[PDB]
Amino acid sequence: KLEQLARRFDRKAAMRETWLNENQRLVAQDNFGYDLAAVEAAKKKHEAIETDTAAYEERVRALEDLARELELENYHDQKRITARKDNILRLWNYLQELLQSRRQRLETTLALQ
Amino acid sequence: KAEDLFMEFAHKASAFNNWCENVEEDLSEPVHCVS
Amino acid sequence: FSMMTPINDLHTADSLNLAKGERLMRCKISSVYRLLDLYGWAQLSDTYVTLRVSKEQDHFLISPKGVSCSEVTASSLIKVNILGEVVEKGSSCFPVDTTGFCLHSAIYAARPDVRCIIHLHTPATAAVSAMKWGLLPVSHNALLVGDMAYFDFNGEMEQEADRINLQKCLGPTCKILVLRNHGVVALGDTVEEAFYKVFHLQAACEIQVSALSSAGGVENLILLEQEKHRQKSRLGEHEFEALMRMLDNLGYRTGYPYRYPLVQEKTKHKSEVEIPATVT
């Protein structure tokens, strides 16, 4: 049973890691529309994306909880689960930092217009 | 107000989408088990 | 009297525990070792090329320590874990050291879309790594390389915090990393694209070293602007097949599967009185 739920851990973390990569890719590019109307449209689209990411923060927390289930049960391979878990957490923190910088970028562009 | 009519849909669409993905990925586990 | 070793040893082994696509990736990275040995870039094992087998199962393939790049084969490769634990060892009676994998491990933790990471220690690339403004695109090949990221390297990355700075400086979408005073690192989804970028950046560095020597200054050179520079074949698909075909013509048992046939093979001249062939 515990090996089955570990293999479910791997299969579950695969999508999370691919999604972290994919929004890294899409927040990487910056294309602000011309003049204040398009700038504020991009601003509210950013706020839509920011509201969207908080939905999967919950799923990442669920992955945390079932990950620490293993170390509660004293699994044979602790290092695997712990390393994958805190690398996922680090990458999510990095995506927050990029979102915050992207936001500050757009308040600067709003303020100078 | 015209904008409010867009933005409550803007909330509910994302909630529906992530609920759909949740029930997508809770589903496909093959579950053999026993007895 | 010969260095020639059959690069495919999967049939003679008939052992070990393998994935569904692992035995082709082993041959591909062994061929990558053979090419980097043949050009004279590297001779001594320092964990140059690392490949990820699968997205979920991890189990990254690396070269054993102590075997020179000329002597590496398919069965000699070692499948290790992300931390350094031995997942599977091939037929290579050598002590296992995974110290050099630590340089690739945090890049594995950073970007998943990469499978192949190639690290160089050539004198030209290490001189460019010590070159403080980095690669100046004064040549066409350096324009073909693309964008670069620069990262300070203190020689250690076992520390928990150094990994954060490394993945910070790498960026979300950048496939060439330049560690200061430590050569270069190339990043690729396939081994073909990574090898193509390695070759082009090595040629660009070789051009740039001679250019900076001969000119004596930046002002004596011309630099075209990055803004001005700004069926389907993948970035390394076309060249790598030619290299594999040429090694097959020499005689290395390269397991790389060719997407299209080479020769038409016009039908020969047939007689009815042939004994029917094969041993069945």
Verify whether the Cβ–Cβ distance A21 to C111 is below 8 Å.
yes
Chain C contact set for A83 (CB, 8 A): 82-83, 109
Chain C contact set for A21 (CB, 8 A): 111-113
Cα separation, B13 vs B17, in Å, equals 6
b/e sequence C231-267, b meaning 16+ C-beta within 10 Å: eeeebbeeebbebbeebeeeebbbbbeeeeeeeeeee
b/e sequence C28-55, b meaning 16+ C-beta within 10 Å: bbbbbbbbbbeeebbeebebbbbbbbee
Verify whether the Cβ–Cβ distance B10 to A59 is below 8 Å.
no
b/e sequence B7-33, b meaning 16+ C-beta within 10 Å: eeeeeeebeeeeeeeeeeeeeeeeeee
Q: Are C173 and C95 in contact (CB under 8 A)?
A: no
Give the pair of three-digit tokens for residue C208. Answer: 């740039």
Helix (H, G, I), strand (E, B) or coil at C101: coil
Q: How many residues does chain A have?
A: 113
| Determination approach | cryo-EM
Q: Does A43 touch chain B (CB under 8 A)?
A: no
Residue of A nearest to B13 (CA): A52
Q: How many residues does chain B have?
A: 35
Task: Tell me which amino acid residue C165 is.
Answer: N
Interface with B, mutate which of A8, A10, A49, A51 (most B CBs under 10 A): A51
Chain A contact set for B11 (CB, 8 A): 51
Residue C81: CB atoms within 10 A of its CB come to: 19
Within chain A, residue ranges assigned H as helices are 2-28, 35-73, 78-111
Q: Does A75 touch chain B (CB under 8 A)?
A: no
Interface with A, mutate which of B4, B12, B27, B29 (most A CBs under 10 A): B29
Roughly what angle, to the nearest 10 degrees, separates helices C162-170 and A78-111? 50
Give the pair of three-digit tokens for residue B7. Answer: 């933005």
Task: Compute CA C25 distance to the chain's CA centroid, rounded to the nearest angstrom.
Answer: 12
Ramachandran angles phi, psi of C169, nearest 5°:
-75, -20
Resolution limit, Å:
3.6
Q: Are C113 and A21 in contact (CB under 8 A)?
A: yes
Chain A contact set for B18 (CB, 8 A): 55-56, 59
Q: Are C191 and C116 in contact (CB under 8 A)?
A: yes
Cα dihedral sign, C10-C12-C13-C17? positive
For chain C, the chains sharing at least 3 beta-carbon pairs closer than 8 angstroms are: A
Q: In what order do the strands lie in the sheet with C78-80?
A: C86-88, C78-80, C60-62, C49-51, C116-119, C184-188, C176-179, C149-151
Residue of C nearest to A18 (CA): C112
Q: What is the DSSP letter of C211?
A: H
Residue of B nearest to A52 (CA): B14
Nearest to B29 among A8, A51, A56 (CB): A8
